[PDB]
Design a protein around this ligand. Structure first.
Ligand SMILES: [Mg+2]
Ligand SMILES: [Mg+2]
Ligand SMILES: [Mg+2]
Ligand SMILES: [Mg+2]
Ligand SMILES: [Mg+2]
Ligand SMILES: [Mg+2]
Ligand SMILES: [Mg+2]
Ligand SMILES: [Mg+2]
Ligand SMILES: [Mg+2]
Ligand SMILES: [Mg+2]
Ligand SMILES: [Mg+2]
Ligand SMILES: [Mg+2]
Ligand SMILES: [Mg+2]
Ligand SMILES: [Mg+2]
Ligand SMILES: [Mg+2]
Ligand SMILES: [Mg+2]
Ligand SMILES: [Mg+2]
Ligand SMILES: [Mg+2]
Ligand SMILES: [Mg+2]
Ligand SMILES: [Mg+2]
Ligand SMILES: [Mg+2]
Ligand SMILES: [Mg+2]
Ligand SMILES: [Mg+2]
Ligand SMILES: [Mg+2]
Ligand SMILES: [Mg+2]
Ligand SMILES: [Mg+2]
Ligand SMILES: [Mg+2]
Ligand SMILES: [Mg+2]
Ligand SMILES: [Mg+2]
Ligand SMILES: [Mg+2]
Ligand SMILES: [Mg+2]
Ligand SMILES: [Mg+2]
Ligand SMILES: [Mg+2]
Ligand SMILES: [Mg+2]
Ligand SMILES: [Mg+2]
Ligand SMILES: [Mg+2]
Ligand SMILES: [Mg+2]
Ligand SMILES: [Mg+2]
Ligand SMILES: [Mg+2]
Ligand SMILES: [Mg+2]
Ligand SMILES: [Mg+2]
Ligand SMILES: [Mg+2]
Ligand SMILES: [Mg+2]
Ligand SMILES: [Mg+2]
Ligand SMILES: [Mg+2]
Ligand SMILES: [Mg+2]
Ligand SMILES: [Mg+2]
Ligand SMILES: [Mg+2]
Ligand SMILES: [Mg+2]
Ligand SMILES: [Mg+2]
Ligand SMILES: [Mg+2]
Ligand SMILES: [Mg+2]
Ligand SMILES: [Mg+2]
Ligand SMILES: [Mg+2]
Ligand SMILES: [Mg+2]
Ligand SMILES: [Mg+2]
Ligand SMILES: [Mg+2]
Ligand SMILES: [Mg+2]
Ligand SMILES: [Mg+2]
Ligand SMILES: [Mg+2]
Ligand SMILES: [Mg+2]
Ligand SMILES: [Mg+2]
Ligand SMILES: [Mg+2]
Ligand SMILES: [Mg+2]
Ligand SMILES: [Mg+2]
Ligand SMILES: [Mg+2]
Ligand SMILES: [Mg+2]
Ligand SMILES: [Mg+2]
Ligand SMILES: [Mg+2]
Ligand SMILES: [Mg+2]
Ligand SMILES: [Mg+2]
Ligand SMILES: [Mg+2]
Lengths: 263, 158, 65, 206
RNA sequence: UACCUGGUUGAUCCUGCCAGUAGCAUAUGCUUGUCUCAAAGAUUAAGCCAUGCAUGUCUAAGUACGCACGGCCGGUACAGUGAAACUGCGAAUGGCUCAUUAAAUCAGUUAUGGUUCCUUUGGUCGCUACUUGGAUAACUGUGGUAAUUCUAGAGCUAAUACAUGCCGACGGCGCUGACUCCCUUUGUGUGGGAUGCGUGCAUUUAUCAGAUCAAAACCAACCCGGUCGCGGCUUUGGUGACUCUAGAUAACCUCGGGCCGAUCGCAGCCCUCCGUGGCGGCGACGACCCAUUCGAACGUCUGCCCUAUCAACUUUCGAUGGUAGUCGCCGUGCCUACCAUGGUGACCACGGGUGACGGGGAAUCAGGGUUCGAUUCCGGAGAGGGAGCCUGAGAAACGGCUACCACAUCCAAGGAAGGCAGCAGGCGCGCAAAUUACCCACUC
RNA sequence: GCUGCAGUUAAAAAGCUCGUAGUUGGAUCUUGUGGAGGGUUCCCCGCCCCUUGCCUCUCGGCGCCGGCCCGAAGCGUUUACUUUGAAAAAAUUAGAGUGUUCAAAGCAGGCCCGAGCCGCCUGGAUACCGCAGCUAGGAAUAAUGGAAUAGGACCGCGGUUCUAUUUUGUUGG
RNA sequence: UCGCUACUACCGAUUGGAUGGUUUAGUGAGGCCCUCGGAUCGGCCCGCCGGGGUCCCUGGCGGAGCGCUGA
């Protein structure tokens, strides 16, 4: 039977970009309900023992999190399967280090340490616009936040830079032809380039083009574009190799020349 | 035209009112009834007949209460005996891949034809769109009639 | 029951179709003597790992340069 | 129980379908309300996801509106006369949507009088004299034409309507499902609907 | 590795099949040293089941007078550990099997502008009060029956259970109009105006508006540049598309049957000042509606094995459609009343069979194909057969309840109790399938 | 036996013709040069009449010294076909990297200081995913269409009619 | 053709037997809904006692309509 919501998640059926093994055991953490979709999230448990190696078994994650050390967007989260996701800024005070969840160019999250004078603001993508009771205009971002009284020029698909202690958006980039963008869905995942186009098929999945810093172009769907810069100048810091998605015939050459077989 | 109520209940368009003010027109005047109509989108021009006409159909996509959304299809007419709705046919080719050859198939569909279009004939092509379920087996409303293929409706002085 | 295991495994040889054929038996017996192997199967392994290389080589050579 | 499933009944081609599962709960039926007339009796039912739902039996009063004058007043409901779908609901006086009812029409008279300073359907001049004429004629001189001439050229209650008040019962149409909102609201007949239903009532019954 | 070989004749050339040959998976026979992996009551009987176990849960933070243990003597809200018991939550996931089921289920593709959503995340939280009511469990004591996770009577007492109900800060505005104040008696041009009713969000009905468009000429009142007849001006948001969102008006209101805190734990302060008046922090909990999340539900296009010794089928016992309702979470013959006579078929309808649950996949494979998929991932369906329902955000739930059918257990013959297609185990069935072991250390 | 069998005599062409569905259908409606990549003509531009085929605009950026020039909006009569993009769960399959002591497997692992580095490097690719639906180029082959008792284009004009809401400041006639 | 021995299916008096599914006619457990019903348990209205105040308000005991009202 299914008569209600499920609550376990099998290890094989889990998302691929979690990069889980196969022979530990039958289950996977099953992210809890949150602001980020179940396939797009990264639970806090998978970030501390599969990536940062800080813990070793699930109980060590539970007793790291209980001591109130970890902060997800300023607030102090105690749930180990909390669904962190794209544009969230984990902070570990007791160590003095910070991170930004951004897709690496193979289409998966990777650790990306940032300077503590940067981990005070995060970007959000506008999803909806509506006028509440008494005539107040609202906003909905990709991570479920609701901003009341936003500027009357910010529209859908735009990006806004908020603060983590107030909300209260500060800057906003407008979606049009010429601005930077990072792609967050499908085949082209974690690539960067100027938008350069947008076609519009009314009633079905408008399509968007892009263009890398090496001529490479790659279409996508508009609901997968995420503007991160005014133009050619990304606001937030970037991972190494900057979304350039080199082919395997190049990846082999760099592996051979660097001879990165040790340290 | 002025007599349209034939059922056991009064037929009127909702979202439309009959005021009772300013009685002076003289020897005749306005019918005392405006018309409700809306646009469909996607590039479909509402037929002038829907505007100027005087009829009631809660399902007509140009005046009544339905929204067009999803698939758009087209097919040739094959029967119109049920009232306000017709039966159309769609022919296509399945592909048997053991052999490298096609095979002919067809499927019949019931659609709903508003009284806006009035001059349809068996053989006409019609372009239809997707609605909410309007009956047991009807999911599609007629959006645009045409006789644009040969053996056309009228002879060659049009 | 669901279980934490790999069922993945595979065979590493293929018996010959003609079971009693002299041109075959004398060649393989020669190859067993000259390298000191144990069964015929120790030869059919090598035959397999070569005949499988020669399929990738061929399917590449039938691509365009 | 009773159910509103699609799968119990046959397809376009006229061929049966064999049962696919046991009746689910989300296909649930429940029996008719059959609102009668009388002192209020409202029950409630729990529907999918909490969400109280008020079933109404034995109603008496309705918040009817008068579209031309923008008035609307809680009014007693006197009777049902015509039912546009089945006729044996008027023989048993069940009160459902788009029924046709007679109401009391008194508060509309009171509003019209006090607003336009004029008389509606009356019989004589004897009853109006001992009281309620102290409202029609006033102390006022300033105001009494400064506004009451703004109420002149407008008091032209239609003949079909004016003929009704002389009995004190008005034809009205329900616009709310009593069995799902507990209330029996609606509007009062104007214009051409009036002629329609006058014809229909005089035609069928009697 | 794109392959053949024996057999009709006295001999020959053919058609043609039977036999050999290689893999695979179920059974079985003979044999067995090492070491790493690891399938295993599917086939027959979705047949029947002895015993044990598989679902419980407490923090600084709902309710502590068990002396049950307890310390420095005191509860003077009251310490502190805390059994039990009320309260909350979960029990609808997981596991097992493959009987049903052929446009059904299922897959890819799309839609909710036609709906519901416990929880999480973010919004939203101002039209006797220094704190109200009566009544239960655990506990004390008396009991009944052969018997059960059976329960009766009496004596006490809690709340985040149950049930009532304030204070603040309204100075709001609209409609009303006794009046009074100037110029026109009036009418019409003036400004105040006490007295009165409505005046938060949500629910239900009805109405209103939801602007700009291309220019001129005569008549009345008229802004402004300024005077006793001319040039110059106008107002949320969104969609491909709304009977959307926001706004205005007149009302309506669910009580016993919507909301705006009579709840709980750590850490502090000011006093026209001496503990009261006052105010400052951090949480736990609950809650209306909106969004978001996990879904769920219904719907569109295309896709199926064998059968003509199944050629016409469907319909007042709704079959296809229209109008109005009932019902339902919403769309809908879903169901009722009236009306029309329709819908499907040689491009195989409808009926029948399937040792048929669908798919991701498996075996063999020059190229094309043939056969398999009960079986660890995803979807569906069912707990002996059929049926009905309680509680809940979620069930037509069987480790829930009620009744009939078939089985079966206990008895003091009055009555009571039951569901291994969970894990082991047993009978039966058969060619055919493991121990009534150990443990929450790993994944969750 | 689609690639791919057979029907005189070996198993087998209805006794004979007509005929609706089904399957199959004759020919025909535009070519050379100046530059570009590849040679010694021929295969992104425009030229014999055409070359993305035009239009006419309007609102907003790109130019020159207002005036005039070119990108976008309409789509070209419709399909099938072919090519490219988008979007498609993992495991299994093919395939890359990595001495499990080799292999089947697995997703790991690799480096130097004796500890005094309180560490460093790097991986967890990629391809496939029929049909049906979505998206943009090509126009050979195959369906399909335009005026024959006509109606195409130029502001060409007369008759006749409904009607839009702007300006003359607004409000009203 | 007749005659022998083994095996396979066919027809058929019995109007076979069983099993399962259909189905007209009649009955119909049990739950839900509705219209009733009212076992029983309360509160406010009149005395005596204790508190306040000028006989009323509280708390208790008893009794009269138990009148009304609630579950
Ligand atoms: Mg389950
Ligand atoms: Mg079930
Ligand atoms: Mg979780
Ligand atoms: Mg709810
Ligand atoms: Mg012979
Ligand atoms: Mg011989
Ligand atoms: Mg053989
Ligand atoms: Mg062998
Ligand atoms: Mg082992
Ligand atoms: Mg096996
Ligand atoms: Mg079995
Ligand atoms: Mg047992
Ligand atoms: Mg405690
Ligand atoms: Mg305590
Ligand atoms: Mg409990
Ligand atoms: Mg629960
Ligand atoms: Mg088992
Ligand atoms: Mg079933
Ligand atoms: Mg069938
Ligand atoms: Mg069948
Ligand atoms: Mg289908
Ligand atoms: Mg699907
Ligand atoms: Mg589907
Ligand atoms: Mg919970
Ligand atoms: Mg909240
Ligand atoms: Mg007691
Ligand atoms: Mg209907
Ligand atoms: Mg209806
Ligand atoms: Mg017929
Ligand atoms: Mg027919
Ligand atoms: Mg059938
Ligand atoms: Mg199968
Ligand atoms: Mg079966
Ligand atoms: Mg193959
Ligand atoms: Mg299967
Ligand atoms: Mg089976
Ligand atoms: Mg099994
Ligand atoms: Mg399953
Ligand atoms: Mg699904
Ligand atoms: Mg059983
Ligand atoms: Mg619950
Ligand atoms: Mg059940
Ligand atoms: Mg269960
Ligand atoms: Mg039970
Ligand atoms: Mg029982
Ligand atoms: Mg059981
Ligand atoms: Mg068992
Ligand atoms: Mg045996
Ligand atoms: Mg075995
Ligand atoms: Mg056995
Ligand atoms: Mg554990
Ligand atoms: Mg042959
Ligand atoms: Mg012969
Ligand atoms: Mg022959
Ligand atoms: Mg012949
Ligand atoms: Mg030809
Ligand atoms: Mg592999
Ligand atoms: Mg390997
Ligand atoms: Mg496949
Ligand atoms: Mg395709
Ligand atoms: Mg094309
Ligand atoms: Mg002409
Ligand atoms: Mg015999
Ligand atoms: Mg015999
Ligand atoms: Mg027989
Ligand atoms: Mg029988
Ligand atoms: Mg019978
Ligand atoms: Mg009956
Ligand atoms: Mg009964
Ligand atoms: Mg009954
Ligand atoms: Mg009652
Ligand atoms: Mg009663």
């Amino acid at each position: 039977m299914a008569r209600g919501p499920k609550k376990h998640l099998k290890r094989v059926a889990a998302p691929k970009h979690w990069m889980l093994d196969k022979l530990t055991s039958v289950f996977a953490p099953r992210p809890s309900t949150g602001p980020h979709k179940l396939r797009e999230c990264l639970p806090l448990i998978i970030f501390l023992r599969n990536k940062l190696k800080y813990a070793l078994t699930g109980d060590e994650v539970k007793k790291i999190c209980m001591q109130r050390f970890i902060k997800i967007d300023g607030k102090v989260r105690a749930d180990i399967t909390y669904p962190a996701g794209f544009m969230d800024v984990i902070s570990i005070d007791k160590t003095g280090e910070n991170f930004r969840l951004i897709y690496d160019t193979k289409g998966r999250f990777a650790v990306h340490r940032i300077t503590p004078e940067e981990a005070k603001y995060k970007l959000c993508k506008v999803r909806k616009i509506f006028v509440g009771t008494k005539g107040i205009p609202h906003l909905v971002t990709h991570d479920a936040r609701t901003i009341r009284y936003p500027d009357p020029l910010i529209k859908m698909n735009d990006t806004i830079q908020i603060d983590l202690e107030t909300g209260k958006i500060t800057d906003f980039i407008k979606f049009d032809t010429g601005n930077l963008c990072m792609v967050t869905g499908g085949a082209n995942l974690g690539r960067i380039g100027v938008i350069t186009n947008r076609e519009r098929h009314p009633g079905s999945f408008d399509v968007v083009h892009v263009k890398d810093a090496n001529g490479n172009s790659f279409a996508t769907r508009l609901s997968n574009i995420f503007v991160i810069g005014k133009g050619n100048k990304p606001w937030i810091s970037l991972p190494r190799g900057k979304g350039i998605r080199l082919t395997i015939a190049e990846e082999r050459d760099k592996r051979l020349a660097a001879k990165q077989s040790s340290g | 035209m002025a007599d349209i109520q034939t059922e056991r209940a009064y037929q009127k368009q909702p979202t439309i009112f009959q005021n009772k003010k300013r009685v002076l027109l003289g020897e005749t005047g306005k019918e005392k009834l405006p018309r409700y109509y809306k646009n469909i989108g996607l590039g479909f021009k509402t037929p002038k007949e829907a505007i100027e006409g005087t009829y009631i159909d809660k399902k007509c996509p140009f005046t009544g209460n339905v929204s067009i959304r999803g698939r758009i299809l087209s097919g040739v007419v094959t029967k119109m005996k049920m009232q306000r709705t017709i039966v159309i046919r769609r022919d296509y080719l399945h592909y048997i891949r053991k052999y490298n050859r096609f095979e002919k198939r067809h499927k019949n569909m019931s659609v709903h034809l508003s009284p806006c279009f009035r001059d349809v004939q068996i053989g006409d092509i019609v372009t239809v769109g997707e609605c909410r379920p309007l009956s047991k087996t009807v999911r599609f409303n007629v959006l645009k009639v045409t006789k644009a293929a040969g053996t056309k409706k009228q002879f060659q002085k049009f | 029951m669901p279980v934490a295991r790999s069922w993945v495994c595979r065979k590493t040889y293929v018996t010959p179709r003609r079971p009693f054929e002299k041109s075959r038996l004398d060649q393989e017996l020669k190859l067993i003597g000259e390298y000191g192997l144990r069964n015929k199967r120790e030869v059919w392994r090598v035959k397999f790992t070569l005949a499988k290389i020669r399929k990738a080589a061929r399917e590449l050579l039938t691509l365009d340069e | 129980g009773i159910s509103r499933d699609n799968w119990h009944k046959r397809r376009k081609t006229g061929g049966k379908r064999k049962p696919y599962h046991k009746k689910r709960k989300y296909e649930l039926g429940r029996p008719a309300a059959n609102t009668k007339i009388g002192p209020r009796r409202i029950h409630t039912v729990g529907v999918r996801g909490g969400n109280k739902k008020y079933r109404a039996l034995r109603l008496d009063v309705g918040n009817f509106s008068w579209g031309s004058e923008c008035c609307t007043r809680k009014t007693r409901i006197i009777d049902v006369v015509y039912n546009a779908s089945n006729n044996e609901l008027v023989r048993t006086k069940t009160l459902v949507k788009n029924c046709i009812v007679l109401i009391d029409s008194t508060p509309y008279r009171q509003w019209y009088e006090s607003h336009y300073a004029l008389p509606l359907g009356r019989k004589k001049g004897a009853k109006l004299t001992p009281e309620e004429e102290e409202i029609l004629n006033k102390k006022r001189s300033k105001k009494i034409q400064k506004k009451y001439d703004e109420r002149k050229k407008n008091a032209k209650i239609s003949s079909l309507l004016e003929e009704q008040f002389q009995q004190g019962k008005l034809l009205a149409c329900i616009a709310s499902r009593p069995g799902q909102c507990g209330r029996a609201d609606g509007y009062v007949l104007e214009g051409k609907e009036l002629e329609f239903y006058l014809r229909k009532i005089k035609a069928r019954k009697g």
